[PDB]
Amino acid sequence: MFINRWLFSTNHKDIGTLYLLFGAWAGMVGTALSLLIRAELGQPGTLLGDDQIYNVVVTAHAFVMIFFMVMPIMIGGFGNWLVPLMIGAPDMAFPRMNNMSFWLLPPSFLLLLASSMVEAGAGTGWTVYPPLAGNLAHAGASVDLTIFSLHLAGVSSILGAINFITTIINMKPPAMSQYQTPLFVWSVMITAVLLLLSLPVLAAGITMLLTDRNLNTTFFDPAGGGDPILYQHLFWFFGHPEVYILILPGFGMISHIVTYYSGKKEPFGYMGMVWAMMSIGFLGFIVWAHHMFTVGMDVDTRAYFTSATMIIAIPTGVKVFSWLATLHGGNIKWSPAMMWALGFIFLFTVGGLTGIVLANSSLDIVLHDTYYVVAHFHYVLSMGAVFAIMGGFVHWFPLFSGYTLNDTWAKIHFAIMFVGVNMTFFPQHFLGLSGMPRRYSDYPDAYTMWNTISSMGSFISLTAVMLMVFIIWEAFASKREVLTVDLTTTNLEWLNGCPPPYHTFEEPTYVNLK
Amino acid sequence: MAYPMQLGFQDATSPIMEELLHFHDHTLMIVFLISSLVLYIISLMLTTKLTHTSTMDAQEVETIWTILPAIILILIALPSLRILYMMDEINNPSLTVKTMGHQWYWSYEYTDYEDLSFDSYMIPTSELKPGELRLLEVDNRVVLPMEMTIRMLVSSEDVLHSWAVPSLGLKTDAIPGRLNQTTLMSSRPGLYYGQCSEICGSNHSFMPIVLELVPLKYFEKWSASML
Amino acid sequence: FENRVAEKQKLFQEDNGLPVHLKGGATDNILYRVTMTLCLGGTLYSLYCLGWASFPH
Amino acid sequence: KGDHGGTGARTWRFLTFGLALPSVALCTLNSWLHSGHRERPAFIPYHHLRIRTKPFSWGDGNHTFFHNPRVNPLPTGYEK
Amino acid sequence: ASAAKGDHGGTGARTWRFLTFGLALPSVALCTLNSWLHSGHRERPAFIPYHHLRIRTKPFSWGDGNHTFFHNPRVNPLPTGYEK
Amino acid sequence: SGGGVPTDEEQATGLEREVMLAARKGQDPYNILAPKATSGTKEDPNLVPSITNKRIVGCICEEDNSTVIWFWLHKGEAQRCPSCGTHYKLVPH
Amino acid sequence: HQTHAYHMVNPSPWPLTGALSALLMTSGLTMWFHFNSMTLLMIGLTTNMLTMYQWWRDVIRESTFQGHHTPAVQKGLRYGMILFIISEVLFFTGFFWAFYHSSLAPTPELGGCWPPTGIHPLNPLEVPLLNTSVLLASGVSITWAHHSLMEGDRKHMLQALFITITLGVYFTLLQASEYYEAPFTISDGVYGSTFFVATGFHGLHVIIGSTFLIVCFFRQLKFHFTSNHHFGFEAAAWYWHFVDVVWLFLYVSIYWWGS
Ligand SMILES: CCCCCCCCCCCCCCCCCC(=O)OCC(COC(=O)CCCCCCCCCCCCCCCCC)OC(=O)CCCCCCCCCCCCCCCCC
Ligand code: HEA
Ligand code: HEA
Ligand SMILES: CCCCC/C=C\C/C=C/C/C=C/C/C=C\CCCC(=O)O[C@H](COC(=O)CCCCCCCCCCCCCCCCC)COP(=O)(O)OCCN
Ligand SMILES: CCCCCC/C=C\CCCCCCCCCC(=O)O[C@H](COC(=O)CCCCCCCCCCCCCCC)COP(=O)(O)OC[C@@H](O)CO
Ligand SMILES: CCCCCCCCCCO[C@@H]1O[C@H](CO)[C@@H](O[C@H]2O[C@H](CO)[C@@H](O)[C@H](O)[C@H]2O)[C@H](O)[C@H]1O
Ligand SMILES: CCCCCCCCCCO[C@@H]1O[C@H](CO)[C@@H](O[C@H]2O[C@H](CO)[C@@H](O)[C@H](O)[C@H]2O)[C@H](O)[C@H]1O
Ligand SMILES: C[C@H](CCC(=O)O)[C@H]1CC[C@H]2[C@@H]3[C@H](O)C[C@@H]4C[C@H](O)CC[C@]4(C)[C@H]3C[C@H](O)[C@]12C
Ligand SMILES: C[C@H](CCC(=O)O)[C@H]1CC[C@H]2[C@@H]3[C@H](O)C[C@@H]4C[C@H](O)CC[C@]4(C)[C@H]3C[C@H](O)[C@]12C
Ligand SMILES: [C-]#N
Ligand code: CUA
Ligand SMILES: [Cu+2]
Ligand SMILES: [Mg+2]
Ligand code: NA
Ligand code: NA
Ligand SMILES: [Zn+2]
């Protein structure tokens, strides 16, 4: 029965639980890697005494946090648990294929571990650009294991996207149109469309890297008439959609949390929120070269990519102002999840603004490949994603487990994290403006003060992560079983109790057309 | 070069970098304003016992929330693009210098007349002369004439690198098989420092760039002396 | 050839409690054990190769 | 991208106001921003241009139908 | 559009069989003729050891590492030229 | 032309066949169609079938509302949507 | 217990055996490229085929033999196959992008021209044109098969499907022969790289699509399809039209415009 249930699952809630456990474990790995980064930088000089190992740590930190923490938690975990419940469906459209999207991730992560254990690892950056990542500068198996890890992660997510799009289109109540589905369900649909279209392009590019390294192709090697810059276009044609993939389910969860703890039945401006996410999804395919403003592109191309990139702040601003307008007039409940969501709004806004700075290709010449970019994305993406994840986890943990958390401990955890991430990443703006490069294991002496502060910040967030583990333990240890939650009339996922039974909606909801 | 506790850009050494400073000042004000307005409104929404929980009409306010950000973006894009097109405008340089990136050092070629080339390596910390800067000095600096428009051509003989000099507003990736052009003009004599800006393996942190800007007559004597 | 779909419908609808991947009978169990043994043993073998490849040899 | 369920009137109005007309407005901006007369090139009486094998059936026979004196030279050059 | 048929009415099985045997398979037969007329071995070109061709950055994982997977000795020279 | 291909009437089985047979009778036991509302007054409540004694109703109170109002409807006296007051009455089997 | 029309699938081991097959194939390719051994790769290919065989066998059992494919379930599978084909279109789009990037801006190492100096392309009017007529003709014959099935005609469905498969096999054998006869190789710079990787992935998809058609042929011999319910045949025909359209793009781009 254990193996049938947890290895042979065809159940959306149990597969969601597997993804949350996997993503939480990966989050420990990725946090440990980030602490090693900041330990190397925490004083001038060398700590590891091996800058290839430092480069391997940075590369693995990013792959772990993106492919094994954020996407499995947001899409595999919250998406599987919540989407079928929010539409009254009895499971996902392809409940068995869903299990393979899960089970592809432990082998994907094992391939990443293998890459770091053999030879001298893949110290490439998560971009994996040739020729650094080719067979002369990274001879041996590490880069090929990294490529295969990405292939398996990509297959998992492509099949998961097929599953979520099919489920959301085909399995709502017959009376429910797309414009009666909750915003989290929209956010998952749009994320899945982006995954469907973008991951096959990455798969093509990394396959061409694999064949240049092993079959004597020359897609990226000028000696054969290839071009390293072609790899960058293919990678970023996926990688820009990927940054919206990482945040869109977060936007969905934030809309639900802000609505709920404002005591409102609905988010402000629902159709504007749908418009904004669709517009971000669409524009997200036409801006990628802003990752390439220093490669030598023509000026008119730089001008186009600057302009298209700035257009995205318009629909994103609609979402920010709409979250503020959802708070407007609320009976505000100062729950820990609400604190996470308010932290998200502010930190996402800071990071999105420094992204707007970077969109100006003239200024990006000076800021590219510096810690300004690292500060932009650890605000807008890294800590945007983490804060929405923690808000969703605190808010929905009682649904998934049947048990309540201690709210005072959860507020303490929020406060420690908010201090820690700001101490870590705010000083990186100064490092970037004053010219410190990213991807460095050591820095000229002038940069010492802000590196020292940033590394001290990293330990504060470590204290928060350890506390989060204790808080989860305390809830399972004490066994306070949920009775009721408010606002079930506008939050269907709660209406089957906590946790809901293995099978829900065996008798579907009744929804008529008036 | 940067100095301890610095918060913003290195001082501008070239006119384009001056322009960038003023453009940055213009944009950062907007970032500050918008970020503080969002913070303020968050606190405004959270500090009243008054309520309004019935459905709110969104059309009127969404015009404000799209038109105003669109205007703001245009007010950023206009100076941004003017500077972009200024940078690209035809200049007619007096000198062309090539740089080739390698793991892990730069080489320089001055082949307008004479065939001069040399390598430029970081000074290890153990060899620095007293008062020299850790991770920044090189054995052979890029000697160049001040107050003159110079064409730099940038490539690589192995992996990607990127040739950067922040105080001149310069960062041009060094890609094998490609010859990327940028223009350099220093308003002042002096030593101007930069660091390799595309991850190129284990010694990416340790292949700096040092320009040495001197009057033309001194540049010519230095060139002549290489014969 | 003759249409024997009805006989397979009766087989795969028999109320014997078997999950669909085993409901064809003993052959299903053989093919399953073969597949699972290859998968699990190959996985153990791949972990050995990792250990081997993790050190200079 | 997304919705794909019913493509009804509501969806096509959403696309009209949410994507199509914003695109027209952006391109209208782009155009009325690169507008402004550009220097007319030196006149050169190339034989493959300003073709006259029969007079035009209007005007003096020598002016094209939407002749713009600022930018359309006659076979003998620009008009005064 | 730049076709020349007619039928329409209904496109059923009879029509698609008609197209299969009356147009598609005759076209395959004709291109099979065209092809089995321009068949034959042309004179292979002088070998020149161009550096953008016969690329070898890592040995192939089969044979002696220096032969492509569908190596044809008659028409595929090695980096050192044709085989004897 | 010729025969030899089974029809659904001949060969569909299981739930597929149940859905086909019910559709012939004009019935919808498997909830494929959206039910059409009544006037929803106390005298003419919306009639909600269930195989049990309670079922979740979602009420789209006005056409084009994006917010759906969800609640369990129990057997017995008709209940009203907490947003619009429209009446629903459970009709077990 | 349910009163919806959707399919609650029995707990299954095939997702796990499929995921482990992927680990074995990828670690297997690594061991082949780097450690001179095919062992893991052979195990992985075997477990992959076993997993596909048993998983799709079970889908047939669930649908033809057990009746779980109600119209709502079939509609989901239609969306799923369309979305899968879209993802495969984007995968090929990356290889077309690489081909156009390299051929529209040929670098000095090529001679600054396309085709590169020293490359002698195949004549697109010879076997490549024959392959084009073969795949176009098989798009006509599969459409005859589909209409025969809908019209209840077993014999002509089987004839037309057999003709379709024969043409797919003919394409594969012609392409195998062309690969052998080609005087350029995958190691012949970016011309060989784009040619063999793009047409090779397409040839893999022809073999996949032909295999799917062969499954459908045997299921039809066993009377699985009804005149109205035959989604496996519909999906194999959509996939086969996808393979035909990718070939037309390859033929126009790489063989004709790129010659
Ligand atoms: C904003 C995120 C929260 C975390 C904030 C932590 C930091 C607090 C600042 C909280 C307020 C931040 C104000 C900027 C701090 C530095 C002042 C400055 O002169 O910056 C100027 C430039 C470069 O300027 C120059 O060319 C040199 C000028 C120096 C001469 C005067 C010296 C003394 C100035 C005082 C500086 C203090 C050092 C700060 C040292 C800080 C160490 C941690 O630097 C930069 O561009 C920094 C780029 C940051 C980009 C994001 C901006 C939007 C977020 C902040 C507003 C939201 C509400 C905050 C309300 C905050 C609510 C929590
Ligand atoms: C969650 C992930 C995420 C998200 C959502 C974003 C969102 C944005 N990003 Fe960022 N970005 C990354 C993750 C993300 N990014 C990562 C990981 C990298 C680096 C990759 C690497 O090299 O490893 C990166 C790199 C990166 C670069 C390249 C810089 C360089 O390498 O030199 C650029 C440049 O344009 C950029 C811009 C932006 C912009 C304009 C947005 C916008 O979508 C933000 C829009 C939001 C707002 C603007 C705030 C809210 C709006 C309002 C309050 C309305 C009013 C505002 C105005 C009128 C301005 N990003
Ligand atoms: C999601 C993405 C993500 C996240 C969360 C993070 C988190 C952190 N990162 Fe990030 N980082 C990247 C993505 C991310 N990073 C990427 C893409 C790069 C670029 C790589 C490259 O250059 O190639 C990078 C690079 C990078 C650098 C630059 C290295 C260099 O240029 O040399 C640094 C330096 O300080 C840094 C530090 C940190 C720190 C201190 C944290 C954290 O310690 C901050 C605190 C956050 C946490 C502790 C999260 C904990 C969450 C969980 C444990 C989940 C729990 C789960 C459930 C409740 C279900 N990162
Ligand atoms: C009959 C028509 C063709 C049918 C298919 C035949 C086999 C091709 C297999 C296709 C797999 C496609 C991958 C493409 C890789 C290259 C193979 C290209 C096609 C091919 O077969 O190319 C051959 C080279 O094969 C070689 O190197 C060896 C190739 C074998 C090893 C491949 C290993 C790499 C596989 C990696 C796959 C990654 C996939 C990831 C998918 C993720 C999606 C989310 C060409 O032979 P040649 O002697 O150089 O020149 C002919 C000279 N007379
Ligand atoms: C470098 C080498 C890397 C190698 C990596 C290899 C990785 C994976 C090993 C794959 C093993 C596959 C095993 C067979 C999977 C069949 C899945 C399938 O067919 O799934 C179906 C759904 O997807 C549908 O239709 C539509 C979708 C069908 C998808 C079939 C499998 C695709 C696997 C490759 C994916 C990437 C494709 C390329 C994109 C770039 C059925 O859904 P179930 O939930 O099962 O059932 C539902 C029941 O109602 C049916 O009665
Ligand atoms: C279902 C469970 C399945 C479990 C997996 C089966 C385990 C197989 C054990 C055999 O292992 C083989 O041992 C050979 C050594 O004896 C290796 O040959 C290699 O090593 C040789 C040197 O002995 C060389 O000739 C070559 O590089 C190469 O052939 C080869 O790599 C390896 O696989
Ligand atoms: C039922 C479950 C149990 C199954 C156990 C399977 C055990 C297989 C062990 C044999 O290992 C093989 O050894 C070969 C020789 O030792 C290798 O060939 C290698 O060496 C050859 C020498 O002839 C070369 O030609 C090849 O290209 C090269 O791949 C081959 O790759 C490898 O697999
Ligand atoms: C028409 C469509 C849906 C309306 C509905 O059926 O409920 C609505 C939803 C969101 C609206 C858009 C957003 O509110 C953002 C923009 C707001 C501006 O005031 C008009 C253009 C603007 C782009 C809007 C056009 C249009 O009214 C949209 C696209
Ligand atoms: C045996 C079967 C008759 C239908 C039924 O079984 O009653 C017939 C009908 C159509 C026949 C097939 C089709 O004519 C297509 C093929 C024709 C080839 O010449 C022989 C094999 C070939 C595959 C045939 C084998 C066999 O005789 C089939 C399969
Ligand atoms: C951000 N890209
Ligand atoms: Cu050279 Cu970094
Ligand atoms: Cu981007
Ligand atoms: Mg860079
Ligand atoms: Na260090
Ligand atoms: Na059909
Ligand atoms: Zn109601």
Numbering used by the authors:
A (entry chain N): 1 to 514
B (entry chain O): 1 to 227
C (entry chain W): 1 to 57
D (entry chain G): 5 to 84
E (entry chain T): 1 to 84
F (entry chain S): 2 to 94
G (entry chain P): 3 to 261
Paper text:
In the CNred, one of the three histidine residues, His290, is released from CuB and replaced with a CN--ligand. The distance between CuB and Nε2 of His290 being 3.16 Å strongly suggests that a coordination bond between CuB and His290 is broken in the CNred. The distance of 2.15 Å between CuB and the nitrogen atom of the bound cyanide indicates that His290 is replaced with the nitrogen atom of CN- upon the cyanide binding, keeping the hydrogen bond between the His290 and OH group of Thr309. The water molecule was not detectable in the fully reduced form, though the Tyr-OH groups have enough space for accepting a water molecule. The CNred structure indicates that blockage of the proton back-leak from the hydrogen bond network of the H-pathway is not as tight as in the fully-oxidized form.
In this paper, the cyanide-bound fully-oxidized, mixed valence (three electron-reduced), and fully reduced (four-electron reduced) forms are abbreviated as CNox, CNmv, and CNred, respectively.
